[PDB]
Coordinates of C-alpha atoms and ligand atoms in Angstrom, one line a residue:
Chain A
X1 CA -28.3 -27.0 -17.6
X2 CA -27.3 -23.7 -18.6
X3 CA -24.3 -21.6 -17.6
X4 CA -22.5 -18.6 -19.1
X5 CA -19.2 -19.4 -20.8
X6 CA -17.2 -16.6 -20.4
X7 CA -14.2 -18.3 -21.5
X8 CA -15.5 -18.8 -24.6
X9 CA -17.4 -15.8 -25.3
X10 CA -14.0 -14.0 -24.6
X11 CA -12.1 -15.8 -27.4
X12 CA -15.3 -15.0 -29.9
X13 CA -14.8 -11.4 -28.4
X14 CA -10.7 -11.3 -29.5
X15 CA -11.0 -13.1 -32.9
X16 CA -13.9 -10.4 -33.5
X17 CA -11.2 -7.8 -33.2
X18 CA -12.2 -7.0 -29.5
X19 CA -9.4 -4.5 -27.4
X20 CA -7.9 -7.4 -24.6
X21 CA -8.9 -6.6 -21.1
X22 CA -6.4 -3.9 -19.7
X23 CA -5.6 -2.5 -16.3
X24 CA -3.4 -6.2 -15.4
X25 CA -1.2 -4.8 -12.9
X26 CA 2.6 -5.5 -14.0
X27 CA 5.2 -6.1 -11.2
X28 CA 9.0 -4.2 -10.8
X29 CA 11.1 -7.6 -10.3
X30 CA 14.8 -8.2 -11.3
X31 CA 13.8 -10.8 -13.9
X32 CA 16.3 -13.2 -12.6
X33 CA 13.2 -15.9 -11.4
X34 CA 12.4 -19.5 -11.8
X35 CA 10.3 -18.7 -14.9
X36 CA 7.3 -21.0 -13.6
X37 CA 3.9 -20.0 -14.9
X38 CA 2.0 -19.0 -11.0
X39 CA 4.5 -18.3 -8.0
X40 CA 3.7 -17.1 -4.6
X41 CA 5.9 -13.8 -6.1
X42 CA 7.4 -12.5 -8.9
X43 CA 9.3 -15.3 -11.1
X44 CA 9.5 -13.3 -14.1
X45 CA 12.9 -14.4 -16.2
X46 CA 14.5 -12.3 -18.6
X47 CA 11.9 -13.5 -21.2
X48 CA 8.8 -12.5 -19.5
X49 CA 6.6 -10.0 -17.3
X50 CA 5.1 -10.9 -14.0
X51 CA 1.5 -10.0 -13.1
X52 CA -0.8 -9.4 -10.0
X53 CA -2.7 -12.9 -10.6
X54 CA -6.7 -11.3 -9.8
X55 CA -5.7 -8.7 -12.2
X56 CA -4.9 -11.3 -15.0
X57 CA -8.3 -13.5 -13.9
X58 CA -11.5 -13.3 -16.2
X59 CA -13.6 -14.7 -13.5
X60 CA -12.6 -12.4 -10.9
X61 CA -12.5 -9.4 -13.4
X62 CA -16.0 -9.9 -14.8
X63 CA -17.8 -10.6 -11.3
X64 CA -18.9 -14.1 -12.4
X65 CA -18.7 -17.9 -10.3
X66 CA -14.9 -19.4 -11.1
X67 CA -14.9 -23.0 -12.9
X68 CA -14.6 -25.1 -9.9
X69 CA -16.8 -27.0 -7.7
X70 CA -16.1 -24.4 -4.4
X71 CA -15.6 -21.2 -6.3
X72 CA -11.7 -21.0 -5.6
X73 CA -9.1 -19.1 -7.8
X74 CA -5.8 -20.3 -8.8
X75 CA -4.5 -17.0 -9.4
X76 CA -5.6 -14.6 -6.8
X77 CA -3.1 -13.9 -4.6
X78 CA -0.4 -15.2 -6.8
X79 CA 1.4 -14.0 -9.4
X80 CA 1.9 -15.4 -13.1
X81 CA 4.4 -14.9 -15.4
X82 CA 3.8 -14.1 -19.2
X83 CA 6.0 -14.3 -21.9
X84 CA 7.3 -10.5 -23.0
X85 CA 5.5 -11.3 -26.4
X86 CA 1.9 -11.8 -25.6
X87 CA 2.3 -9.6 -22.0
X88 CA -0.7 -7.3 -23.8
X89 CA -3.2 -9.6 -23.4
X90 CA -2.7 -11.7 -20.3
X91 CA -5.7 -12.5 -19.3
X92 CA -6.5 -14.3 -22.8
X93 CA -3.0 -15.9 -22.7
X94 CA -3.6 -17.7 -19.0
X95 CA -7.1 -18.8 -20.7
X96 CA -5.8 -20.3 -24.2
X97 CA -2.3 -22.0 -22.4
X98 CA -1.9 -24.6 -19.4
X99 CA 0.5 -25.4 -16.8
X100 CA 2.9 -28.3 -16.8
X101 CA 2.6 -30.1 -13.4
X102 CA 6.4 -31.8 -13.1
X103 CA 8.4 -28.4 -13.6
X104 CA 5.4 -25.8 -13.4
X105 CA 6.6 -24.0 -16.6
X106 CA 4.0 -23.0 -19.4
X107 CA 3.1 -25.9 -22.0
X108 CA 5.4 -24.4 -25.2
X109 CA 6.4 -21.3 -23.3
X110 CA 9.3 -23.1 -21.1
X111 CA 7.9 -26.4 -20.9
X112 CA 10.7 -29.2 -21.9
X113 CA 9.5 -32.5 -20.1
X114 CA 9.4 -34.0 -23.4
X115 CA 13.3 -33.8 -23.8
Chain B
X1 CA 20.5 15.0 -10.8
X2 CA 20.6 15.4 -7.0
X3 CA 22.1 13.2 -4.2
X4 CA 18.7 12.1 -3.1
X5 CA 17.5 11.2 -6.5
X6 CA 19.2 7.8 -5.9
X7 CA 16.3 6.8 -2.7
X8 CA 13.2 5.8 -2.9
X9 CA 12.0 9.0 -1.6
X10 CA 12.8 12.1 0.9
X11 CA 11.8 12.5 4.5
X12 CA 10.9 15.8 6.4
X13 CA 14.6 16.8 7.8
X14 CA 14.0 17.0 11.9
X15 CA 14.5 21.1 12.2
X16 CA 11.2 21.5 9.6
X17 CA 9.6 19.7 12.6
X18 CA 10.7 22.1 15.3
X19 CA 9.4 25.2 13.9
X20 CA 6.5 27.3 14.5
X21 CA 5.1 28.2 10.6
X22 CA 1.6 29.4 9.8
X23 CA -0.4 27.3 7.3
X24 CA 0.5 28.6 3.6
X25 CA -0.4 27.7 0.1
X26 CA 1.5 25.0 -1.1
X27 CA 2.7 25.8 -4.2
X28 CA 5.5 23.3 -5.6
X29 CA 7.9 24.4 -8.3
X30 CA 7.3 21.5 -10.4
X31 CA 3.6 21.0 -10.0
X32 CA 2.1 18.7 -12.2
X33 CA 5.0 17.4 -13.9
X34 CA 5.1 13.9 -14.5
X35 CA 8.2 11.4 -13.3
X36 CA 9.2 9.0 -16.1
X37 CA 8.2 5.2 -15.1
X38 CA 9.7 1.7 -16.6
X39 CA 8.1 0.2 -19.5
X40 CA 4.4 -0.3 -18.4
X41 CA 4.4 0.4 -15.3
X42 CA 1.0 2.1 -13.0
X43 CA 1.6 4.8 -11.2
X44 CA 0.5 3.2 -7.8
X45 CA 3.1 0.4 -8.6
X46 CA 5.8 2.6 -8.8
X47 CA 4.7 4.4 -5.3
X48 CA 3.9 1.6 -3.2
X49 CA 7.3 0.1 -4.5
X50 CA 8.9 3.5 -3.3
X51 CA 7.5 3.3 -0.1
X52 CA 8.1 -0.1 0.4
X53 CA 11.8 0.5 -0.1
X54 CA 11.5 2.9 2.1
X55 CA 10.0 0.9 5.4
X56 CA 12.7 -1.9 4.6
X57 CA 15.3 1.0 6.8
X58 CA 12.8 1.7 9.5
X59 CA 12.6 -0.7 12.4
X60 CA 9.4 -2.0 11.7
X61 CA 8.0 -5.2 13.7
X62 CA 7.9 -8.3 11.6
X63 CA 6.9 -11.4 13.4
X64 CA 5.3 -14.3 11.9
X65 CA 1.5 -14.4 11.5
X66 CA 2.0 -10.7 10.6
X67 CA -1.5 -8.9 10.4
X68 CA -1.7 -6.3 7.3
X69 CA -4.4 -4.0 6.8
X70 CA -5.0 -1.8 4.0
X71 CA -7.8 1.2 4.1
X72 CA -8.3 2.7 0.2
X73 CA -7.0 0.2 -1.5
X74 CA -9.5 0.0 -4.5
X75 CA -9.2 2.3 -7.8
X76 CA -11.0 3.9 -10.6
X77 CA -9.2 0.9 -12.9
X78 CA -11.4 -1.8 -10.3
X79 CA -7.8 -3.6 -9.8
X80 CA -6.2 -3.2 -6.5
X81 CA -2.3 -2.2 -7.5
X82 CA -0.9 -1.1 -4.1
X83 CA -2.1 -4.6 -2.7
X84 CA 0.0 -6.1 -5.1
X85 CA 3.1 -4.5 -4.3
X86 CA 2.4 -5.3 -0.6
X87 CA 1.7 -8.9 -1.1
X88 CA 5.0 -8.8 -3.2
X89 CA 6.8 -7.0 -0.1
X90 CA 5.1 -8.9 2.9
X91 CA 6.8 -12.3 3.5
X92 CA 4.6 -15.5 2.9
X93 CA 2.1 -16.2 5.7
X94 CA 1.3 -12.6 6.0
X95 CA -2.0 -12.0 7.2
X96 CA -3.1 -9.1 4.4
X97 CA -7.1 -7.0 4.5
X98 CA -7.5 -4.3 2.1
X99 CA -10.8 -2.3 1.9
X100 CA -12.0 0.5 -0.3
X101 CA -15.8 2.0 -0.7
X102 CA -15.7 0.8 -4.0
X103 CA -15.6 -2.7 -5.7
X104 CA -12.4 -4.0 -6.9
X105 CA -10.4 -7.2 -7.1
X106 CA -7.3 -7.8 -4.7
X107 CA -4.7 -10.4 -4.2
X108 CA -5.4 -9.3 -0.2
X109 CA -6.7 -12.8 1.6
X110 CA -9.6 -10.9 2.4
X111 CA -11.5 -7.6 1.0
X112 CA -14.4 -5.3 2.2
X113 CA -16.4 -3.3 0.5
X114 CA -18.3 0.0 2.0
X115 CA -17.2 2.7 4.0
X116 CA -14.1 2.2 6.4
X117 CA -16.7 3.3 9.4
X118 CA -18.7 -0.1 8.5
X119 CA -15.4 -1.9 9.1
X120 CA -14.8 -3.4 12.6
X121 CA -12.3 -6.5 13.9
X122 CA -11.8 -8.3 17.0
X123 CA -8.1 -8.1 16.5
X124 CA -4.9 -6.0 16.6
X125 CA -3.0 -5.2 13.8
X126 CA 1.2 -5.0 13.1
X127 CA 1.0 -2.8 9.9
X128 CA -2.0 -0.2 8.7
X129 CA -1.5 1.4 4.8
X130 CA -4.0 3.8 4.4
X131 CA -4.2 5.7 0.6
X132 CA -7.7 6.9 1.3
X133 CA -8.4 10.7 -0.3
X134 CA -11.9 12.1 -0.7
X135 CA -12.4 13.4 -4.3
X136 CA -14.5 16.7 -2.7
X137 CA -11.1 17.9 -1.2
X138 CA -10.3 18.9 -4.5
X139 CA -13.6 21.6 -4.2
X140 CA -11.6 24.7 -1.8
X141 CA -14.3 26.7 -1.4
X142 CA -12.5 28.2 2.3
X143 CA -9.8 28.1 4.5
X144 CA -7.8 24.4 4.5
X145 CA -9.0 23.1 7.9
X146 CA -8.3 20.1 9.6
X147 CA -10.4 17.0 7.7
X148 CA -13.0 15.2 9.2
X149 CA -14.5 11.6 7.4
X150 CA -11.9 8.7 7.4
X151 CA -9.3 10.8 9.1
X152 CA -11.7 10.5 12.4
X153 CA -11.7 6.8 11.8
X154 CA -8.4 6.0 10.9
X155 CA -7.5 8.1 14.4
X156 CA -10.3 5.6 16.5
X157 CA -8.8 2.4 14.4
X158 CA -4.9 3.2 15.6
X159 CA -5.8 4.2 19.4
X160 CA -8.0 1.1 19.9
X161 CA -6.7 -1.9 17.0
X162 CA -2.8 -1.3 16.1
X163 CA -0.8 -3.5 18.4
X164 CA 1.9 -1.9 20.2
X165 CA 5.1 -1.9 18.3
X166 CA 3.1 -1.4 15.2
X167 CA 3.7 0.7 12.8
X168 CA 1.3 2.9 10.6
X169 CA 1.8 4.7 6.6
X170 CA -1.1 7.0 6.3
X171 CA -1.8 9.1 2.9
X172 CA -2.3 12.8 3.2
X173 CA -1.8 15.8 0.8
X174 CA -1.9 20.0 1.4
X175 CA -6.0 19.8 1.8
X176 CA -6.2 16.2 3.1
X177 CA -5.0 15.9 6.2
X178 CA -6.3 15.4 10.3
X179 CA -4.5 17.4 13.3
X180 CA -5.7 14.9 15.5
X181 CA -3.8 12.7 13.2
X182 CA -0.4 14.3 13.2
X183 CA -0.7 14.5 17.6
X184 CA -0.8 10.3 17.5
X185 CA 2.6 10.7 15.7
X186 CA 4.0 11.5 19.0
X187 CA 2.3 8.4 20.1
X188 CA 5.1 6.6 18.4
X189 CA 8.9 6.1 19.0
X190 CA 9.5 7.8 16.0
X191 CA 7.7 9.6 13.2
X192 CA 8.3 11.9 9.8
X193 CA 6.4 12.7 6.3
X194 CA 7.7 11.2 3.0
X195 CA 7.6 12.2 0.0
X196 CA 7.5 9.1 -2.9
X197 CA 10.7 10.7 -5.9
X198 CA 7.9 9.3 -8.3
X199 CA 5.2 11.8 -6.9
X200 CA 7.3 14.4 -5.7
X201 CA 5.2 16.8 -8.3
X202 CA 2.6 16.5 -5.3
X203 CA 2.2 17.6 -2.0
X204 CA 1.0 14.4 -0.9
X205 CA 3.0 12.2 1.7
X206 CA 3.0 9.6 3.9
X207 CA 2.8 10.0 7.7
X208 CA 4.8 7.1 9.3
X209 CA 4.3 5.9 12.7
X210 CA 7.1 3.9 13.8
X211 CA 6.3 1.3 16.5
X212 CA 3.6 2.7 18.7
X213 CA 4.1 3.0 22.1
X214 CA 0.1 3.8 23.0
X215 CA 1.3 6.9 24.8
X216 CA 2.4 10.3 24.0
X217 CA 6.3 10.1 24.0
X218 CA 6.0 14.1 22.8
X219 CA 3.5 16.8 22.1
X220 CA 2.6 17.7 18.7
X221 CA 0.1 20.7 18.0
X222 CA -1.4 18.9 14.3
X223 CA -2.0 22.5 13.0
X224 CA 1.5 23.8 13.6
X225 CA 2.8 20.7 12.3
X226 CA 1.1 20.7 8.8
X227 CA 2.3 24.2 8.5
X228 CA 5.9 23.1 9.6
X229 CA 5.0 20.5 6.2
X230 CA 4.0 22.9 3.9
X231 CA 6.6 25.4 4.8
X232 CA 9.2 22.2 4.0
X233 CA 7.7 21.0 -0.1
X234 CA 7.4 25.1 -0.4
X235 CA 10.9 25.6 0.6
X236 CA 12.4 22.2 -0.7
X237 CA 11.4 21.4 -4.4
X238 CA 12.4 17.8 -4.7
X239 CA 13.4 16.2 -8.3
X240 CA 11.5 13.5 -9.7
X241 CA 12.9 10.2 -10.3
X242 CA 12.3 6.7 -10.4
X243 CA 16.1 5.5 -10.4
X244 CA 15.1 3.5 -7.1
X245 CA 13.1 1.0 -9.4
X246 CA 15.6 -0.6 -11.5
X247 CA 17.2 -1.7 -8.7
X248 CA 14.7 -4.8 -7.0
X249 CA 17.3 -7.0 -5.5
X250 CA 16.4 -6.3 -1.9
X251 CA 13.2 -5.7 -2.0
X252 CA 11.6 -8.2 0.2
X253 CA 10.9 -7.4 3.5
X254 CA 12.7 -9.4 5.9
X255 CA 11.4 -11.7 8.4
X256 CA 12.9 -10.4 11.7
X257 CA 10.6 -12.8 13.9
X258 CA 9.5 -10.3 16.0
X259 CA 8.4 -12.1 19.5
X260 CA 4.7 -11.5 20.1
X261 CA 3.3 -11.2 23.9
X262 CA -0.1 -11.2 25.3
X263 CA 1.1 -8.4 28.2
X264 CA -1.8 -6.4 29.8
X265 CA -1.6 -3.3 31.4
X266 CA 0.7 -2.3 34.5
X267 CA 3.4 -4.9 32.8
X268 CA 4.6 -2.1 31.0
X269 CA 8.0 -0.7 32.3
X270 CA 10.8 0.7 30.7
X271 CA 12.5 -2.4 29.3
X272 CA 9.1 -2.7 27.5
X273 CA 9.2 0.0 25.9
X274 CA 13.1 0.1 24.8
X275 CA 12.0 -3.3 22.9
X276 CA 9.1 -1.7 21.2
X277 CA 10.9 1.4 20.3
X278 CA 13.8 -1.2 18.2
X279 CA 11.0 -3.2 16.5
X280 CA 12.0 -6.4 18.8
X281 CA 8.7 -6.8 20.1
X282 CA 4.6 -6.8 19.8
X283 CA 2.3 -6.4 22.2
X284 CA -1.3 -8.0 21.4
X285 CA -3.5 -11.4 21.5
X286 CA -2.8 -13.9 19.1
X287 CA -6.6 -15.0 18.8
X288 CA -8.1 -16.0 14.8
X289 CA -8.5 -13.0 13.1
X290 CA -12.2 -11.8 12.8
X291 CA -13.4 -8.8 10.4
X292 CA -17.0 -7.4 9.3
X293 CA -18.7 -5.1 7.3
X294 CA -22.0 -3.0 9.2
X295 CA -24.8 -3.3 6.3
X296 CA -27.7 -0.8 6.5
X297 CA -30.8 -1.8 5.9
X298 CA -33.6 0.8 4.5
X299 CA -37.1 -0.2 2.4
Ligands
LIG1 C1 -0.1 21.3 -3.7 N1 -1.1 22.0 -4.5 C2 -2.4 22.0 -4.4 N2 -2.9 22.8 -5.3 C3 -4.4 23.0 -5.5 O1 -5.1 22.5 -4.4 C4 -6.0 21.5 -4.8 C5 -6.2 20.5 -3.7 O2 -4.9 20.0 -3.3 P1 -4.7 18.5 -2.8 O3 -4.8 18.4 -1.3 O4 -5.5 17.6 -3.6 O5 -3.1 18.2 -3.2 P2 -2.4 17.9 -4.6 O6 -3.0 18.7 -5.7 O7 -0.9 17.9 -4.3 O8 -2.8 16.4 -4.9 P3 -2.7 15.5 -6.2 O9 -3.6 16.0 -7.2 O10 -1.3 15.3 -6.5 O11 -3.3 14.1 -5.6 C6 -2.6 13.4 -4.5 C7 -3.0 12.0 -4.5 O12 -4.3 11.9 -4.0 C8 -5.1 10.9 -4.8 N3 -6.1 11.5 -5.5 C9 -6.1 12.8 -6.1 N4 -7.3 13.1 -6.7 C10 -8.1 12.0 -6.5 C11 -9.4 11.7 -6.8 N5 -10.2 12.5 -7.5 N6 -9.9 10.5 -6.4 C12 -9.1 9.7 -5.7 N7 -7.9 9.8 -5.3 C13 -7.4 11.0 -5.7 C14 -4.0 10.2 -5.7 O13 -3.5 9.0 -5.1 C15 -3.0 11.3 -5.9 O14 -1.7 10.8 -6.3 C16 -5.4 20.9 -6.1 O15 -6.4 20.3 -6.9 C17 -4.9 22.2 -6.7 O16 -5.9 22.9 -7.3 C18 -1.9 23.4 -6.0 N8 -2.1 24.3 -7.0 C19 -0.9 24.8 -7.5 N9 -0.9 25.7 -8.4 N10 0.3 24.3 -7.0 C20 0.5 23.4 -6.0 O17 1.6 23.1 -5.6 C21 -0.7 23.0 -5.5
LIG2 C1 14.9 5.9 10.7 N1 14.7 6.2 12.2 C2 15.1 7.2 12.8 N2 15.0 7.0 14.1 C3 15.5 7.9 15.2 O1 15.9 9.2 14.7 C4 17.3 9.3 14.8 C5 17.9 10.0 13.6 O2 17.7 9.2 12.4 P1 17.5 10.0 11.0 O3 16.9 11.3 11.2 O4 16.9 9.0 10.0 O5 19.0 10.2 10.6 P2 20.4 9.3 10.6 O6 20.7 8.9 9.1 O7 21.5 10.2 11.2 O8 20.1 8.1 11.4 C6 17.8 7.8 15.0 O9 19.1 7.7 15.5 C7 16.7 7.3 15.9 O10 16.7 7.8 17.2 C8 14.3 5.9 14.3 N3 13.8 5.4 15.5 C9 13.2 4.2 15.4 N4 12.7 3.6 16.4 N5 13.0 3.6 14.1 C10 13.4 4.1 12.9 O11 13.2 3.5 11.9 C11 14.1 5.3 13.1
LIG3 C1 -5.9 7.2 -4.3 S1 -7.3 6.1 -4.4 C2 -6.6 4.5 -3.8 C3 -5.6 4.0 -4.8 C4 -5.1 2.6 -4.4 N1 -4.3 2.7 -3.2 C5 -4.2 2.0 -5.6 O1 -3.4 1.1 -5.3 O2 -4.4 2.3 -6.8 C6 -8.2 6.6 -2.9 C7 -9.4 5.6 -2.5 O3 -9.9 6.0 -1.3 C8 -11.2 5.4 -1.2 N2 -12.0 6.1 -0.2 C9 -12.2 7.4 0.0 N3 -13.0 7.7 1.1 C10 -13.2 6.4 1.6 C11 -13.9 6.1 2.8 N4 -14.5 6.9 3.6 N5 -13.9 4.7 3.1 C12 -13.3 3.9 2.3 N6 -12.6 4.1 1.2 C13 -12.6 5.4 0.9 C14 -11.8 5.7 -2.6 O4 -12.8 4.8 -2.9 C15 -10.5 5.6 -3.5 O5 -10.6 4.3 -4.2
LIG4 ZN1 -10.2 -15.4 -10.1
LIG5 ZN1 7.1 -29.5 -17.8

């Protein structure tokens, strides 16, 4: 019954004062996009950064099985977008948040469904 | 700041190709200086969006179902940035490979690992990248000659698996570079070295092959042409500048929905060939794309 819970282990890793995984790739785009969380390219508005979505995934970064059933990654080959104030750890940020399946925004980072 | 500081880049003017120079030291004025990027951005981001820009005035092929493969694409960093700026670049659908002797993660659809020798594939391909350099060029213990390693590779890999009316953007610097290399140029309806305005510090460059033709359309001596290189960055020092970047509005490359025929040989007349030199049309199977990696096996 065991597995390693890198997810986990990662957050015990930043609240221990741990330096957030670098070397995400950031993308040149006008910053003029949709603003949803993972695009097929750049989205980034004027309030956020778009990523390389493999660089930005712990699973694919650390060498380790993804959390799903196949072993398929919802990032690779995408791209997500990051709010301009946590764009130093993105990594971290696509773990801790979730998307919002109606508009496809960021729960409490563009996420309004409840308005 | 000069008029040219404004493109993505510079390419080698057509009288530096018609000369006759012997092989010199390179020795660029600015040398090591460093261009000043946007706000976090890599290096190879910055040059594969330069070179991008670039290929969006050639006549490159695009049809849909487009193949992409991209030798060298890994990095000390393990992250595969010049993937991403393709992936960005390529329209959606876009068959993209990358492969690099070292592990990394991509956003390609599909990666190998291991030396591009170990690669093979059953299919033609519309677009090769490659931004392979062997760190043991750096050690010039003699006289720059003509490189062997991938370069003899990459020269089997276009003759036998780029589709004609492909196109090909292949790295090379003063010590790494292949004369059989700069010969398949005239393989091509058109050809020339550029120079990234974010690396100009450097004497490397991209050879482009514009839509290949599979037949010598001129004769190119690879050792005269280097020289005719060298004697160009020697004699043209080119400012740094990353002015092209702020500006990403059109970007994308467009989807031109270049026709793709299955024609074999003896169906290729002139009309043929005036279609392949415009970037109109591409000449291979249209079979499921099938790749592999040789593994060795000792005790
Ligand atoms: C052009 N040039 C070459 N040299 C000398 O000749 C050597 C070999 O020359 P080169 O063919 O490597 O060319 P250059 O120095 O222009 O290459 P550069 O370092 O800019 O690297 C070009 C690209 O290759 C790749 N690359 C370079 N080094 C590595 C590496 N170790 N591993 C992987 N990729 C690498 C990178 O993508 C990089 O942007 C240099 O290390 C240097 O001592 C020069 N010396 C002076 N004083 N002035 C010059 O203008 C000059
Ligand atoms: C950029 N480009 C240049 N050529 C050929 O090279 C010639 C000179 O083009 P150029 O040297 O880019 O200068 P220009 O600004 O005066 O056009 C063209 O008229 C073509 O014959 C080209 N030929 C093809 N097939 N495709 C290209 O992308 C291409
Ligand atoms: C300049 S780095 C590539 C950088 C990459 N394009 C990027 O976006 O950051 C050159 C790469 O060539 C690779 N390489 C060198 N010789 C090779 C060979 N024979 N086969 C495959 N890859 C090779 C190296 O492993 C190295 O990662
Ligand atoms: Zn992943
Ligand atoms: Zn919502």
């Amino acid at each position: 019954a065991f597995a390693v819970d890198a997810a986990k282990a990662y957050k015990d890793y930043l609240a221990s004062g741990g330096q957030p995984i670098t070397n995400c790739v950031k993308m040149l785009c006008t910053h003029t996009g949709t603003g949803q969380a993972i695009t097929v390219t750049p989205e980034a508005n004027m309030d956020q950064e778009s990523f390389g979505g493999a660089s930005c995934c712990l699973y694919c970064r650390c060498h380790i099985d993804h959390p799903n059933p196949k072993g398929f990654c919802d990032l690779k080959g995408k791209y997500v977008q990051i709010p301009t104030t946590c764009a130093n750890d993105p990594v971290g940020f696509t773990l801790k948040n979730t998307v919002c399946t109606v508009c496809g925004m960021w729960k409490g980072y563009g996420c309004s469904c409840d308005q | 700041a000069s008029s040219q500081a404004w493109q993505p880049g510079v390419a080698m003017p057509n009288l530096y190709k018609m000369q006759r120079m012997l092989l010199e030291k390179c020795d660029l004025q600015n040398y090591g200086d460093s261009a000043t990027l946007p706000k976090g951005i890599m290096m190879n981001v910055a040059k594969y969006t330069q070179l991008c820009q670039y290929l969006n005035t050639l006549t490159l092929a695009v049809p849909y179902n487009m193949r992409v493969i991209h030798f060298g694409a890994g990095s000390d960093k393990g992250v595969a940035p010049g993937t991403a700026v393709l992936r960005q670049w390529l329209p959606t659908g876009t068959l993209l490979v990358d492969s690099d002797l070292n592990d990394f993660v991509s956003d390609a659809d599909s990666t190998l690992i291991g030396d591009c020798a170990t690669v093979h594939t059953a299919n033609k391909w519309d677009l090769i990248i490659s931004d392979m350099y062997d760190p043991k060029t750096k050690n010039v213990t003699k006289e720059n000659d003509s490189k062997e390693g991938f370069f003899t590779y990459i020269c089997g890999f276009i003759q036998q698996k780029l589709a004609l009316g492909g196109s090909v953007a292949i790295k090379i610097t003063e010590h790494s570079w292949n004369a059989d290399l700069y010969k398949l140029m005239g393989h091509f309806a058109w050809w020339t070295a550029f120079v990234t305005n974010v690396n100009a510090s450097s004497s490397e460059a991209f050879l482009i092959g514009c839509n290949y033709l599979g037949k010598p359309r001129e004769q190119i001596d690879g050792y005269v042409m280097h020289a005719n290189y060298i004697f160009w960055r020697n004699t043209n020092p080119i400012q740094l500048s990353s002015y092209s970047l702020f500006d990403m509005s059109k970007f994308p490359l467009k989807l031109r929905g270049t026709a793709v025929m299955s024609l074999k040989e003896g169906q290729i007349n002139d009309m043929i060939l005036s279609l392949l030199s415009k970037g109109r049309l591409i000449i291979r199977e249209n079979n499921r794309v099938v790749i592999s990696s040789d593994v060795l096996v000792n005790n």
